[PDB]
Swiss-Prot record:
The chain holds residues 3 to 120 of 480 of the full protein. AKT1 is one of 3 closely related serine/threonine-protein kinases (AKT1, AKT2 and AKT3) called the AKT kinase, and which regulate many processes including metabolism, proliferation, cell survival, growth and angiogenesis. This is mediated through serine and/or threonine phosphorylation of a range of downstream substrates. Over 100 substrate candidates have been reported so far, but for most of them, no isoform specificity has been reported. It comes from Homo sapiens. It is found in: Cytoplasm; Nucleus; Cell membrane; Mitochondrion intermembrane space. Ubiquitinated; undergoes both 'Lys-48'- and 'Lys-63'-linked polyubiquitination. TRAF6-induced 'Lys-63'-linked AKT1 ubiquitination is critical for phosphorylation and activation. When ubiquitinated, it translocates to the plasma membrane, where it becomes phosphorylated. When fully phosphorylated and translocated into the nucleus, undergoes 'Lys-48'-polyubiquitination catalyzed by TTC3, leading to its degradation by the proteasome. Also ubiquitinated by TRIM13 leading to its proteasomal degradation. Acetylated on Lys-12 and Lys-18 by the histone acetyltransferases EP300 and KAT2B. Acetylation results in reduced phosphorylation and inhibition of activity. Deacetylated at Lys-12 and Lys-18 by SIRT1. SIRT1-mediated deacetylation relieves the inhibition. Interacts with BTBD10. Interacts with KCTD20. Interacts (via the C-terminus) with CCDC88A (via its C-terminus). Interacts with GRB10; the interaction leads to GRB10 phosphorylation thus promoting YWHAE-binding. Interacts with AGAP2 (isoform 2/PIKE-A); the interaction occurs in the presence of guanine nucleotides. Interacts with AKTIP. Interacts (via PH domain) with MTCP1, TCL1A and TCL1B. Interacts with CDKN1B; the interaction phosphorylates CDKN1B promoting 14-3-3 binding and cell-cycle progression. Interacts with MAP3K5 and TRAF6. Interacts with BAD, PPP2R5B, STK3 and STK4. Binding of the PH domain to phosphatidylinositol 3,4,5-trisphosphate (PI(3,4,5)P3) following phosphatidylinositol 3-kinase alpha (PIK3CA) activity results in its targeting to the plasma membrane. This is RAC-alpha serine/threonine-protein kinase. Residues 3-101 form the PH domain.
Length: 113
């Protein structure tokens, strides 16, 4: 069954306004990545799958930024996050990567041959 893999505060850059705001995110092993205004009913402000997504690291405009990029149909979705240390970024990117890898292995076992 589906369990939380990692949860915690992330600084998220907005989609339309490119400002940064603190958000409480939860990553689940089915690829669910859900973000709330406060530590959690109250609906989430962000809700997307990390399945088939790409992790990118950047230092501008903020150090220790990571981007989750997902190509969906014609559209490309990007979600931008900042944490205070490069170690915390590695903490998050490793967790997201391992979940994505689990789901990729599952897809490949279904689609290959």
């Amino acid at each position: 069954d589906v369990a939380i893999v990692k949860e915690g505060w992330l600084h998220k850059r907005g989609k339309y306004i490119k400002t940064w705001r603190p958000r409480y995110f939860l990553l689940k092993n089915d690829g669910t990545f859900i973000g709330y205004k406060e530590r959690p009913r109250e609906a989430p402000l962000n809700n997307f799958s990390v399945a088939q997504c790409q992790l990118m690291k950047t230092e501008r405009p903020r150090p220790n930024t990571f981007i989750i990029r997902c190509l969906q149909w014609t559209t490309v979705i990007e979600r931008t996050f900042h944490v205070e240390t490069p170690e915390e970024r590695e903490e998050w990117t490793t967790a997201i990567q391992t979940v994505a890898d689990g789901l990729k292995k599952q897809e490949e076992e279904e689609m290959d041959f």
